Each structure stands twice: as structure tokens, then as C-alpha cells.
Design a protein around this ligand. Sequence first.
Ligand SMILES: [Zn+2]
Ligand SMILES: [Zn+2]
Ligand SMILES: [Zn+2]
Length: 178
Amino acid sequence: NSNICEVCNKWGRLFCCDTCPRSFHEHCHIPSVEANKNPWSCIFCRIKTIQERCPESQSGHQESEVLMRQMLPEEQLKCEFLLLKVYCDSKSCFFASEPYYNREGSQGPQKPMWLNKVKTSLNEQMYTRVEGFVQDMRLIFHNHKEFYREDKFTRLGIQVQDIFEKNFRNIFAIQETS
Ligand SMILES: [Zn+2]
Ligand SMILES: [Zn+2]
Ligand SMILES: [Zn+2]
């Protein structure tokens, strides 16, 4: 196994996957690393299994169909994994915890959103369709862009949105287009 957390790239109290070399902090893994379970397989491994069980699941899909899917166990897991891929980028720090808004010439968003709130909502099974999860993720970056206006800090929202969207297209096998 690796000697650093796959998510945050720090050492510490690490749980090791039994089927690949990755390791995790308890609350860095999504879902949080399970109490017992020997062997234990990490979310990367569980996603790879889904793909292997149904190779056709990698054929192209339309986004509109993916969004309307109900949050059955496999879609729950895919959302968890997509959330985790965003936390994997260090720039996710800016979007993890509850924001506050007090900048001359700007007004805060009507509906604040942040990664830890999405993580709690997934954990509590609050989303009934993929669309709910995706809407809240895209809302994080849209709120940021609107609030920061012409400040160059707006770019952080563009950057982490790009990581979200690339991973969304990969995990849900969105049909490639020009
Ligand atoms: Zn970690
Ligand atoms: Zn693994
Ligand atoms: Zn199949």
C-alpha cells in the first residue's frame, strides 16, 4: 500500500485497500472507511467492479438521461466517487466548508452551497436522482463566479468546476462530443 492518503496526499492514520495499493484517511474516503469489513475494498475498486460486471456501461450516454436516473446503489456510489475526485484536488479547500460573503460591491448567493454540505446530503440519502447531486455541485462554482465578479479569484471556481465536469463525463460515460 501507498504511505499517503489518496485524497489529501498526507500521512497519518491510514486505512489500506485490500484490492489495490491505495490508502485513506477515515473521513477522506467517501463513504467514510467502514468499521469492520475484511477484506475492505476502496471506492476506486468498487467502481472498477461495476464497470467489469457491465462492460456496456462504458458506452456513451446522454447527460439528460444520466441526470434523471434515480439514486439506486450504483448511482449513489458513482456520485460518491465523483465527489471524492473533487476533494482529490487541493483547490477543493476553497469550496469545502461553509462560505460567508462580505465584499464591497457584491451580494452573497441566495442559496449557498459547499462540498461538506453535499457530502452530508449524500450520506443522509437526501438526493433521489443524480440531478440533485449534480445541481448542488454546479451551484458551488456558479455562486463563486457570480460573487467574485472580476476578481481573479473567480478562476478558482473555473478550475475546480473543470475537474468536476471531466470526472462527471468519465464516471457516467457521457458520450464524447466536439
Ligand atoms: Zn486524507
Ligand atoms: Zn482499492
Ligand atoms: Zn452486462
